[PDB]
mmCIF file of C-alpha atoms in Angstrom:
data_model
loop_
_atom_site.group_PDB
_atom_site.id
_atom_site.type_symbol
_atom_site.label_atom_id
_atom_site.label_comp_id
_atom_site.label_asym_id
_atom_site.label_seq_id
_atom_site.Cartn_x
_atom_site.Cartn_y
_atom_site.Cartn_z
ATOM 1 C CA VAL W 25 0.238 -0.098 -0.082
ATOM 2 C CA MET W 26 1.124 3.477 -0.002
ATOM 3 C CA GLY W 27 -1.047 6.729 -0.433
ATOM 4 C CA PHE W 28 0.053 11.113 0.953
ATOM 5 C CA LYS W 29 -0.689 12.791 3.093
ATOM 6 C CA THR W 30 -1.641 16.720 3.515
ATOM 7 C CA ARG W 31 -2.467 19.470 5.780
ATOM 8 C CA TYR W 32 -2.728 23.216 4.485
ATOM 9 C CA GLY W 33 -5.725 26.149 5.076
ATOM 10 C CA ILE W 34 -6.730 28.874 3.338
ATOM 11 C CA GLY W 35 -8.031 32.188 4.536
ATOM 12 C CA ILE W 36 -9.838 35.830 4.327
ATOM 13 C CA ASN W 37 -8.478 39.025 4.506
ATOM 14 C CA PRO W 38 -9.413 40.160 7.292
ATOM 15 C CA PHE W 39 -10.787 44.050 4.968
ATOM 16 C CA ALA W 40 -11.954 41.479 2.283
ATOM 17 C CA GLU W 41 -15.962 42.355 2.405
ATOM 18 C CA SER W 42 -14.777 45.764 2.945
ATOM 19 C CA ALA W 43 -18.609 47.001 2.854
ATOM 20 C CA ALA W 44 -18.457 46.413 6.419
ATOM 21 C CA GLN W 45 -17.655 49.036 8.831
ATOM 22 C CA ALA W 46 -17.173 46.240 12.148
ATOM 23 C CA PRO W 47 -17.517 43.410 11.394
ATOM 24 C CA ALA W 48 -19.796 40.722 13.717
ATOM 25 C CA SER W 49 -18.105 39.035 16.887
ATOM 26 C CA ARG W 50 -14.820 40.041 17.463
ATOM 27 C CA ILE W 51 -13.401 36.653 17.237
ATOM 28 C CA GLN W 52 -14.209 35.728 13.194
ATOM 29 C CA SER W 53 -13.366 32.567 11.567
ATOM 30 C CA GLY W 54 -11.136 33.773 8.172
ATOM 31 C CA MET W 55 -11.993 30.131 6.554
ATOM 32 C CA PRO W 56 -14.790 31.459 4.024
ATOM 33 C CA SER W 57 -18.371 30.461 3.696
ATOM 34 C CA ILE W 58 -21.991 31.624 2.754
ATOM 35 C CA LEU W 59 -21.876 34.302 5.151
ATOM 36 C CA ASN W 60 -17.894 35.818 5.040
ATOM 37 C CA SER W 61 -16.782 35.342 1.188
ATOM 38 C CA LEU W 62 -19.685 34.636 -0.915
ATOM 39 C CA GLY W 63 -19.582 37.736 -3.717
ATOM 40 C CA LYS W 64 -17.931 39.787 -1.224
ATOM 41 C CA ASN W 65 -13.838 40.686 -1.933
ATOM 42 C CA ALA W 66 -12.666 43.928 -2.551
ATOM 43 C CA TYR W 67 -9.472 42.387 -3.958
ATOM 44 C CA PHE W 68 -11.473 39.970 -7.048
ATOM 45 C CA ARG W 69 -14.190 41.455 -9.545
ATOM 46 C CA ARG W 70 -15.605 38.689 -11.885
ATOM 47 C CA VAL W 71 -17.695 39.559 -15.827
ATOM 48 C CA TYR W 72 -18.997 37.578 -17.402
ATOM 49 C CA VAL W 73 -18.832 38.051 -21.519
ATOM 50 C CA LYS W 74 -20.895 37.138 -24.777
ATOM 51 C CA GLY W 75 -20.521 38.370 -28.082
ATOM 52 C CA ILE W 76 -16.885 36.763 -29.508
ATOM 53 C CA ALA D 29 -25.961 29.576 30.372
ATOM 54 C CA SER D 30 -23.686 31.428 27.947
ATOM 55 C CA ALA D 31 -20.279 29.170 29.516
ATOM 56 C CA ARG D 32 -18.435 32.683 29.337
ATOM 57 C CA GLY D 33 -20.201 33.880 31.730
ATOM 58 C CA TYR D 34 -21.950 37.439 32.114
ATOM 59 C CA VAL D 35 -21.381 41.344 32.472
ATOM 60 C CA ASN D 36 -23.780 42.883 35.067
ATOM 61 C CA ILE D 37 -24.668 46.555 33.993
ATOM 62 C CA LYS D 38 -26.072 48.737 36.074
ATOM 63 C CA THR D 39 -27.704 52.023 35.079
ATOM 64 C CA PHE D 40 -28.203 54.949 37.945
ATOM 65 C CA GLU D 41 -31.806 56.167 38.297
ATOM 66 C CA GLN D 42 -30.867 59.904 36.913
ATOM 67 C CA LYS D 43 -33.126 63.459 36.396
ATOM 68 C CA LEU D 44 -33.505 65.481 33.689
ATOM 69 C CA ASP D 45 -36.120 67.976 33.906
ATOM 70 C CA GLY D 46 -39.765 68.443 36.083
ATOM 71 C CA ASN D 47 -41.118 65.033 35.942
ATOM 72 C CA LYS D 48 -38.491 63.435 33.554
ATOM 73 C CA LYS D 49 -36.356 60.531 34.371
ATOM 74 C CA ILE D 50 -34.322 57.992 33.891
ATOM 75 C CA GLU D 51 -34.983 54.390 35.492
ATOM 76 C CA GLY D 52 -32.263 52.783 37.026
ATOM 77 C CA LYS D 53 -31.859 49.325 34.920
ATOM 78 C CA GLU D 54 -30.054 46.467 35.949
ATOM 79 C CA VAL D 55 -28.879 43.792 32.637
ATOM 80 C CA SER D 56 -26.492 41.201 32.829
ATOM 81 C CA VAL D 57 -25.218 40.459 29.086
ATOM 82 C CA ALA D 58 -23.620 36.954 27.932
ATOM 83 C CA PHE D 59 -19.931 38.332 27.738
ATOM 84 C CA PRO D 60 -19.622 37.720 23.709
ATOM 85 C CA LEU D 61 -22.705 39.460 23.049
ATOM 86 C CA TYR D 62 -21.651 42.861 25.213
ATOM 87 C CA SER D 63 -18.016 42.187 23.776
ATOM 88 C CA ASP D 64 -19.652 41.707 20.003
ATOM 89 C CA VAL D 65 -22.147 44.933 20.454
ATOM 90 C CA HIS D 66 -22.429 47.683 23.550
ATOM 91 C CA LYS D 67 -23.424 51.952 23.193
ATOM 92 C CA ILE D 68 -22.550 52.118 27.550
ATOM 93 C CA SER D 69 -20.887 54.717 27.569
ATOM 94 C CA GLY D 70 -21.770 58.408 29.410
ATOM 95 C CA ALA D 71 -24.824 56.606 31.116
ATOM 96 C CA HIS D 72 -24.065 56.614 34.942
ATOM 97 C CA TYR D 73 -23.786 53.296 35.037
ATOM 98 C CA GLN D 74 -22.015 50.910 37.000
ATOM 99 C CA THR D 75 -20.384 47.141 35.518
ATOM 100 C CA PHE D 76 -18.559 44.338 37.012
ATOM 101 C CA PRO D 77 -17.752 40.604 35.764
ATOM 102 C CA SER D 78 -19.692 37.054 36.596
ATOM 103 C CA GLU D 79 -19.624 33.525 36.117
ATOM 104 C CA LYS D 80 -23.188 33.728 36.506
ATOM 105 C CA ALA D 81 -25.688 36.831 35.545
ATOM 106 C CA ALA D 82 -25.969 38.855 38.809
ATOM 107 C CA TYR D 83 -29.487 40.314 37.796
ATOM 108 C CA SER D 84 -32.649 39.618 36.543
ATOM 109 C CA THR D 85 -32.759 40.469 33.043
ATOM 110 C CA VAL D 86 -30.281 38.607 30.912
ATOM 111 C CA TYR D 87 -29.123 39.111 27.898
ATOM 112 C CA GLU D 88 -28.048 34.892 26.448
ATOM 113 C CA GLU D 89 -25.162 35.426 23.353
ATOM 114 C CA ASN D 90 -28.650 34.727 21.356
ATOM 115 C CA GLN D 91 -30.026 37.699 21.593
ATOM 116 C CA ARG D 92 -28.436 40.058 19.380
ATOM 117 C CA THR D 93 -30.702 43.010 18.039
ATOM 118 C CA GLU D 94 -32.839 41.966 21.430
ATOM 119 C CA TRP D 95 -29.996 43.207 23.562
ATOM 120 C CA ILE D 96 -28.909 46.131 21.443
ATOM 121 C CA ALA D 97 -32.529 47.481 21.556
ATOM 122 C CA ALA D 98 -32.022 47.197 25.483
ATOM 123 C CA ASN D 99 -28.915 48.887 24.777
ATOM 124 C CA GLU D 100 -30.209 51.874 23.324
ATOM 125 C CA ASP D 101 -33.407 52.121 25.741
ATOM 126 C CA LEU D 102 -30.335 52.716 29.053
ATOM 127 C CA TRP D 103 -30.876 56.013 27.735
ATOM 128 C CA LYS D 104 -35.286 56.189 27.425
ATOM 129 C CA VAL D 105 -36.369 59.150 29.690
ATOM 130 C CA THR D 106 -39.884 59.167 31.569
ATOM 131 C CA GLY D 107 -42.171 60.425 33.396
ATOM 132 C CA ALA L 19 -13.897 56.986 26.659
ATOM 133 C CA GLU L 20 -11.945 54.055 24.397
ATOM 134 C CA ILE L 21 -11.619 51.579 26.969
ATOM 135 C CA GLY L 22 -9.896 48.840 26.481
ATOM 136 C CA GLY L 23 -12.289 46.206 28.749
ATOM 137 C CA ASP L 24 -11.269 43.248 30.471
ATOM 138 C CA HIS L 25 -11.739 39.327 30.354
ATOM 139 C CA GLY L 26 -14.747 37.358 31.622
ATOM 140 C CA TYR L 27 -12.047 35.613 34.461
ATOM 141 C CA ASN L 28 -13.286 32.908 32.253
ATOM 142 C CA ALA L 29 -10.632 30.546 31.680
ATOM 143 C CA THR L 30 -11.892 30.362 27.738
ATOM 144 C CA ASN L 31 -12.070 33.384 27.392
ATOM 145 C CA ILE L 32 -8.883 34.296 28.544
ATOM 146 C CA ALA L 33 -7.541 31.761 26.418
ATOM 147 C CA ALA L 34 -8.870 32.876 23.198
ATOM 148 C CA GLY L 35 -7.949 37.011 24.238
ATOM 149 C CA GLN L 36 -11.013 37.620 24.344
ATOM 150 C CA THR L 37 -12.311 41.594 26.117
ATOM 151 C CA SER L 38 -15.409 43.174 26.917
ATOM 152 C CA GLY L 39 -14.206 46.578 25.110
ATOM 153 C CA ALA L 40 -12.569 47.854 22.023
ATOM 154 C CA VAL L 41 -9.297 45.666 21.980
ATOM 155 C CA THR L 42 -8.214 41.899 21.141
ATOM 156 C CA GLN L 43 -5.892 39.766 22.390
ATOM 157 C CA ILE L 44 -3.229 37.940 20.931
ATOM 158 C CA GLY L 45 -3.634 34.908 23.928
ATOM 159 C CA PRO L 46 -1.769 35.157 27.650
ATOM 160 C CA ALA L 47 1.832 34.301 26.834
ATOM 161 C CA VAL L 48 3.047 31.084 28.363
ATOM 162 C CA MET L 49 4.471 30.825 31.518
ATOM 163 C CA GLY L 50 5.980 27.099 30.691
ATOM 164 C CA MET L 51 4.602 23.628 31.360
ATOM 165 C CA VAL L 52 4.683 21.362 34.502
ATOM 166 C CA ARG L 53 5.453 17.377 34.122
ATOM 167 C CA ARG L 54 4.108 15.373 36.249
ATOM 168 C CA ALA L 55 7.704 13.696 38.474
ATOM 169 C CA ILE L 56 8.566 10.090 37.936
ATOM 170 C CA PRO L 57 9.066 8.171 41.564
ATOM 171 C CA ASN L 58 12.365 6.927 42.549
ATOM 172 C CA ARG F 6 4.286 12.680 49.956
ATOM 173 C CA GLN F 7 2.136 14.862 47.828
ATOM 174 C CA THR F 8 3.493 16.914 46.509
ATOM 175 C CA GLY F 9 5.924 14.683 44.136
ATOM 176 C CA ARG F 10 8.993 17.308 44.373
ATOM 177 C CA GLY F 11 10.338 17.587 47.519
ATOM 178 C CA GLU F 12 10.058 18.116 51.852
ATOM 179 C CA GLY F 13 8.677 21.487 53.113
ATOM 180 C CA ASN F 14 11.487 24.169 52.548
ATOM 181 C CA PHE F 15 10.147 26.599 54.419
ATOM 182 C CA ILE F 16 7.884 28.191 57.641
ATOM 183 C CA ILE F 17 6.040 31.061 58.616
ATOM 184 C CA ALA F 18 5.177 31.114 61.510
ATOM 185 C CA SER F 19 3.713 32.813 64.174
ATOM 186 C CA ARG F 20 6.091 35.094 66.702
ATOM 187 C CA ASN F 21 5.342 32.905 70.055
ATOM 188 C CA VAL F 22 6.805 29.881 67.694
ATOM 189 C CA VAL F 23 9.711 31.370 66.379
ATOM 190 C CA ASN F 24 10.656 32.136 70.072
ATOM 191 C CA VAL F 25 10.812 28.823 70.683
ATOM 192 C CA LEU F 26 12.239 27.609 68.098
ATOM 193 C CA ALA F 27 15.471 30.203 68.645
ATOM 194 C CA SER F 28 15.197 29.225 72.065
ATOM 195 C CA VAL F 29 16.086 25.255 71.705
ATOM 196 C CA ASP F 30 18.765 23.589 70.524
ATOM 197 C CA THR F 31 17.548 21.988 67.289
ATOM 198 C CA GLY F 32 20.530 19.849 66.447
ATOM 199 C CA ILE F 33 20.248 15.988 68.011
ATOM 200 C CA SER F 34 20.816 17.124 71.149
ATOM 201 C CA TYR F 35 19.900 16.198 75.369
ATOM 202 C CA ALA F 36 17.326 18.015 76.556
ATOM 203 C CA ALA F 37 18.713 21.971 76.107
ATOM 204 C CA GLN F 38 16.866 25.541 76.414
ATOM 205 C CA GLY F 39 18.156 28.925 77.202
ATOM 206 C CA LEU F 40 17.641 32.410 75.740
ATOM 207 C CA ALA F 41 16.122 33.077 71.809
ATOM 208 C CA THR F 42 19.343 33.564 69.896
ATOM 209 C CA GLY F 43 19.183 31.107 66.520
ATOM 210 C CA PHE F 44 16.917 32.950 64.710
ATOM 211 C CA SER F 45 15.441 37.099 65.048
ATOM 212 C CA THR F 46 11.970 36.659 66.698
ATOM 213 C CA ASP F 47 12.281 39.971 65.900
ATOM 214 C CA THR F 48 9.742 41.471 62.753
ATOM 215 C CA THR F 49 10.999 45.150 63.245
ATOM 216 C CA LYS F 50 14.801 44.124 61.531
ATOM 217 C CA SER F 51 13.019 42.208 59.224
ATOM 218 C CA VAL F 52 10.763 39.238 58.622
ATOM 219 C CA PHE F 53 13.339 36.501 57.669
ATOM 220 C CA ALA F 54 14.316 34.687 61.059
ATOM 221 C CA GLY F 55 17.013 32.596 60.158
ATOM 222 C CA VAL F 56 17.411 29.051 58.513
ATOM 223 C CA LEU F 57 16.048 26.456 61.079
ATOM 224 C CA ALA E 11 -26.464 25.984 21.337
ATOM 225 C CA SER E 12 -23.406 25.139 22.542
ATOM 226 C CA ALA E 13 -22.588 27.840 20.660
ATOM 227 C CA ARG E 14 -18.917 26.442 19.590
ATOM 228 C CA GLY E 15 -19.928 23.495 17.476
ATOM 229 C CA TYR E 16 -20.522 20.098 18.302
ATOM 230 C CA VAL E 17 -19.042 17.017 17.696
ATOM 231 C CA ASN E 18 -21.109 14.742 16.162
ATOM 232 C CA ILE E 19 -20.254 10.722 16.729
ATOM 233 C CA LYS E 20 -22.364 7.694 15.589
ATOM 234 C CA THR E 21 -21.606 4.050 15.942
ATOM 235 C CA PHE E 22 -23.197 1.305 14.317
ATOM 236 C CA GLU E 23 -24.551 -2.036 15.332
ATOM 237 C CA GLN E 24 -22.100 -4.627 16.830
ATOM 238 C CA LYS E 25 -23.498 -8.405 16.779
ATOM 239 C CA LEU E 26 -21.712 -9.381 20.650
ATOM 240 C CA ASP E 27 -23.532 -12.759 21.798
ATOM 241 C CA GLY E 28 -26.086 -15.180 20.741
ATOM 242 C CA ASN E 29 -29.593 -12.493 20.291
ATOM 243 C CA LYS E 30 -27.119 -9.332 21.703
ATOM 244 C CA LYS E 31 -26.375 -6.046 20.562
ATOM 245 C CA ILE E 32 -24.454 -3.070 20.944
ATOM 246 C CA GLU E 33 -27.415 -0.765 19.188
ATOM 247 C CA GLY E 34 -26.030 2.123 16.689
ATOM 248 C CA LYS E 35 -26.394 5.219 18.493
ATOM 249 C CA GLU E 36 -26.501 9.147 17.195
ATOM 250 C CA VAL E 37 -25.315 11.815 20.001
ATOM 251 C CA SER E 38 -23.810 14.893 18.639
ATOM 252 C CA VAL E 39 -21.679 16.587 22.336
ATOM 253 C CA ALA E 40 -21.121 20.134 22.601
ATOM 254 C CA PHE E 41 -17.645 20.579 21.240
ATOM 255 C CA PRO E 42 -15.791 21.285 24.644
ATOM 256 C CA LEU E 43 -17.442 18.352 26.602
ATOM 257 C CA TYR E 44 -16.540 16.320 24.334
ATOM 258 C CA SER E 45 -13.056 17.731 24.817
ATOM 259 C CA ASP E 46 -13.188 17.275 28.567
ATOM 260 C CA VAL E 47 -14.863 13.631 28.300
ATOM 261 C CA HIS E 48 -14.344 10.886 25.405
ATOM 262 C CA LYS E 49 -14.320 7.480 25.682
ATOM 263 C CA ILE E 50 -15.397 6.708 22.521
ATOM 264 C CA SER E 51 -12.665 4.710 21.081
ATOM 265 C CA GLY E 52 -12.683 1.035 20.690
ATOM 266 C CA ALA E 53 -16.830 1.679 20.264
ATOM 267 C CA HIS E 54 -17.348 0.861 16.242
ATOM 268 C CA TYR E 55 -18.107 4.670 15.519
ATOM 269 C CA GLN E 56 -17.232 7.720 13.278
ATOM 270 C CA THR E 57 -17.765 11.834 14.113
ATOM 271 C CA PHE E 58 -17.179 14.557 12.693
ATOM 272 C CA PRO E 59 -17.437 18.326 13.351
ATOM 273 C CA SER E 60 -20.209 20.676 13.059
ATOM 274 C CA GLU E 61 -21.646 23.944 13.416
ATOM 275 C CA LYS E 62 -25.223 22.936 14.960
ATOM 276 C CA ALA E 63 -25.499 19.156 16.230
ATOM 277 C CA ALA E 64 -26.059 16.618 12.985
ATOM 278 C CA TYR E 65 -27.845 14.497 15.299
ATOM 279 C CA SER E 66 -31.299 14.600 17.748
ATOM 280 C CA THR E 67 -29.466 13.720 20.954
ATOM 281 C CA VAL E 68 -27.532 16.742 21.727
ATOM 282 C CA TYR E 69 -25.057 16.992 25.259
ATOM 283 C CA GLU E 70 -25.122 20.595 25.235
ATOM 284 C CA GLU E 71 -22.059 22.199 27.951
ATOM 285 C CA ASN E 72 -24.828 21.730 31.553
ATOM 286 C CA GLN E 73 -24.996 18.238 30.985
ATOM 287 C CA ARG E 74 -21.412 17.237 31.560
ATOM 288 C CA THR E 75 -22.738 13.766 33.652
ATOM 289 C CA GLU E 76 -25.370 13.208 31.596
ATOM 290 C CA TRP E 77 -22.852 12.978 28.882
ATOM 291 C CA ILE E 78 -20.780 10.590 31.059
ATOM 292 C CA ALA E 79 -23.164 8.118 31.751
ATOM 293 C CA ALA E 80 -24.238 8.774 27.885
ATOM 294 C CA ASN E 81 -20.942 8.221 26.707
ATOM 295 C CA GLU E 82 -20.700 4.621 29.080
ATOM 296 C CA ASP E 83 -23.664 3.452 27.610
ATOM 297 C CA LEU E 84 -22.165 3.029 23.979
ATOM 298 C CA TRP E 85 -21.138 -0.560 25.056
ATOM 299 C CA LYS E 86 -24.320 -1.137 26.785
ATOM 300 C CA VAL E 87 -25.129 -4.965 25.352
ATOM 301 C CA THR E 88 -28.736 -5.051 24.973
ATOM 302 C CA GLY E 89 -31.665 -7.870 23.823
ATOM 303 C CA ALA G 25 -8.760 -33.125 39.092
ATOM 304 C CA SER G 26 -5.883 -33.114 36.590
ATOM 305 C CA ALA G 27 -3.582 -32.975 39.490
ATOM 306 C CA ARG G 28 -1.250 -31.129 37.391
ATOM 307 C CA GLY G 29 -3.815 -27.788 36.757
ATOM 308 C CA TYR G 30 -6.161 -27.050 34.445
ATOM 309 C CA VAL G 31 -5.861 -24.950 30.428
ATOM 310 C CA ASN G 32 -9.054 -23.013 30.599
ATOM 311 C CA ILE G 33 -10.637 -21.765 27.199
ATOM 312 C CA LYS G 34 -13.276 -19.773 26.478
ATOM 313 C CA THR G 35 -14.857 -19.527 22.569
ATOM 314 C CA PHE G 36 -16.771 -16.429 22.065
ATOM 315 C CA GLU G 37 -19.809 -17.132 20.558
ATOM 316 C CA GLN G 38 -19.620 -15.810 16.577
ATOM 317 C CA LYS G 39 -22.033 -15.145 13.780
ATOM 318 C CA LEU G 40 -21.208 -16.927 10.641
ATOM 319 C CA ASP G 41 -24.969 -16.145 8.152
ATOM 320 C CA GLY G 42 -28.792 -16.062 8.337
ATOM 321 C CA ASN G 43 -30.019 -18.770 11.002
ATOM 322 C CA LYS G 44 -25.632 -19.935 11.381
ATOM 323 C CA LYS G 45 -23.522 -19.091 14.352
ATOM 324 C CA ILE G 46 -20.734 -20.653 16.484
ATOM 325 C CA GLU G 47 -22.332 -21.410 19.977
ATOM 326 C CA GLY G 48 -20.009 -19.708 22.796
ATOM 327 C CA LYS G 49 -19.122 -22.521 24.939
ATOM 328 C CA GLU G 50 -16.584 -22.085 28.392
ATOM 329 C CA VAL G 51 -14.598 -25.482 28.965
ATOM 330 C CA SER G 52 -11.701 -26.287 31.364
ATOM 331 C CA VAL G 53 -9.289 -29.183 30.176
ATOM 332 C CA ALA G 54 -6.481 -30.886 31.865
ATOM 333 C CA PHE G 55 -3.159 -29.459 31.598
ATOM 334 C CA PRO G 56 -1.978 -33.094 29.802
ATOM 335 C CA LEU G 57 -5.107 -33.542 27.723
ATOM 336 C CA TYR G 58 -5.242 -30.214 26.477
ATOM 337 C CA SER G 59 -1.724 -29.914 25.617
ATOM 338 C CA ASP G 60 -1.431 -33.885 24.112
ATOM 339 C CA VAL G 61 -5.143 -32.495 21.896
ATOM 340 C CA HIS G 62 -6.019 -28.836 20.773
ATOM 341 C CA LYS G 63 -7.831 -27.775 17.545
ATOM 342 C CA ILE G 64 -8.261 -24.815 19.100
ATOM 343 C CA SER G 65 -6.528 -21.940 16.455
ATOM 344 C CA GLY G 66 -8.644 -19.627 14.238
ATOM 345 C CA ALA G 67 -11.222 -20.336 16.149
ATOM 346 C CA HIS G 68 -12.481 -16.830 18.285
ATOM 347 C CA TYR G 69 -11.443 -18.216 21.409
ATOM 348 C CA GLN G 70 -8.835 -16.894 24.352
ATOM 349 C CA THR G 71 -6.839 -19.246 27.347
ATOM 350 C CA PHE G 72 -5.265 -19.056 30.384
ATOM 351 C CA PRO G 73 -4.141 -21.354 32.394
ATOM 352 C CA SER G 74 -5.346 -22.738 36.575
ATOM 353 C CA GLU G 75 -4.784 -24.258 39.468
ATOM 354 C CA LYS G 76 -8.266 -25.818 39.322
ATOM 355 C CA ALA G 77 -10.555 -26.024 36.320
ATOM 356 C CA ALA G 78 -11.947 -22.412 36.187
ATOM 357 C CA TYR G 79 -15.437 -23.785 34.416
ATOM 358 C CA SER G 80 -18.614 -25.973 35.037
ATOM 359 C CA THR G 81 -17.615 -28.612 32.232
ATOM 360 C CA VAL G 82 -14.670 -30.516 32.614
ATOM 361 C CA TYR G 83 -12.068 -32.534 30.161
ATOM 362 C CA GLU G 84 -10.301 -34.831 32.671
ATOM 363 C CA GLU G 85 -7.385 -36.180 30.983
ATOM 364 C CA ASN G 86 -8.691 -39.608 31.728
ATOM 365 C CA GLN G 87 -11.692 -39.388 28.762
ATOM 366 C CA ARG G 88 -9.276 -38.436 25.986
ATOM 367 C CA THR G 89 -11.612 -38.602 23.256
ATOM 368 C CA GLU G 90 -14.810 -37.200 24.630
ATOM 369 C CA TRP G 91 -12.171 -34.105 24.715
ATOM 370 C CA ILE G 92 -10.916 -34.674 21.424
ATOM 371 C CA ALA G 93 -14.653 -34.885 19.930
ATOM 372 C CA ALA G 94 -15.365 -31.216 22.118
ATOM 373 C CA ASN G 95 -12.653 -29.493 20.063
ATOM 374 C CA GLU G 96 -14.476 -30.533 16.838
ATOM 375 C CA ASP G 97 -17.889 -28.981 18.402
ATOM 376 C CA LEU G 98 -16.381 -26.171 19.297
ATOM 377 C CA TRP G 99 -16.746 -25.639 15.534
ATOM 378 C CA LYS G 100 -20.740 -26.490 15.238
ATOM 379 C CA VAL G 101 -22.547 -23.834 14.059
ATOM 380 C CA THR G 102 -25.954 -23.959 14.994
ATOM 381 C CA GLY G 103 -29.595 -22.236 14.066
#
């Protein structure tokens, strides 16, 4: 037998949502989900294209 | 219980005008709730930490806005 | 009145660095580790 | 026995106890006592009386 | 809720003796409670973390000893 | 008694198929008898020595073949 194992973790820039004046709960998870990153990260803007 | 303790807040009754007063109030706020949001400053109050709520009115962590409204209400002036 | 606040005198709150006021802490440093002694 | 680390190394005691300790021959010897000399029995000069 | 998430534990039915068994059980234990006491080893089991209890039987922080007993009960052999 | 001690064998009941099981059994075998014959290998069992038979069923040395048959029977599958 054989195989591989790995561990990493990812996360949110603390100011990424940009709209908030302040975060809730004072200590929050930085792991992306529905409530903290979806459609909200100020560092990235996605535009669809058509007609090409 | 919050199991993180409580913040015990007492508001001391004060006179604003003839027949206008801000009543005293006693509330306990789950530690993480108080920590999350509060507008108590300049209010004529006193506060201490405890392992269990010191007061009959308690805002458990799962309140957020019931608490915010309750904290804004510390400024309400009545008869 | 930028009140830093304090911990809840609750072991979890301390460990997590959570404050009741303005500033969140890194955590409670370390004072080392105590290992149980081995009998002779 | 209970700490698992070591035997008692210090004593905190009232003035009367220290006056007794200071007035007894603490080594292995015949019954003996006299004026206190072994430890300071004073609290004015210090709070450290001496080593028993 | 536990306000710190849960440890979700599932056990599988075990054929221990003639017409005897350890029924599979599904429990959810407040994370810090699980952390304090967990005898689940050698239980023919499976676990995972969650935000909300994944199961109908949940042991919250204030249960302490109901949980310890419930944990021990995971190996009870019945009819 | 065997006057040389006994080997105590516990066979753990196991399920084989729909309505098929090998029944659990507890036997004590005179040390020299056990030493002569033991078909207890791969059997789902555990053993220990003792100064006296640990179980109600004992195979004394002067039985010889009762025990040999008893061993084959430790594999018998019933309803």
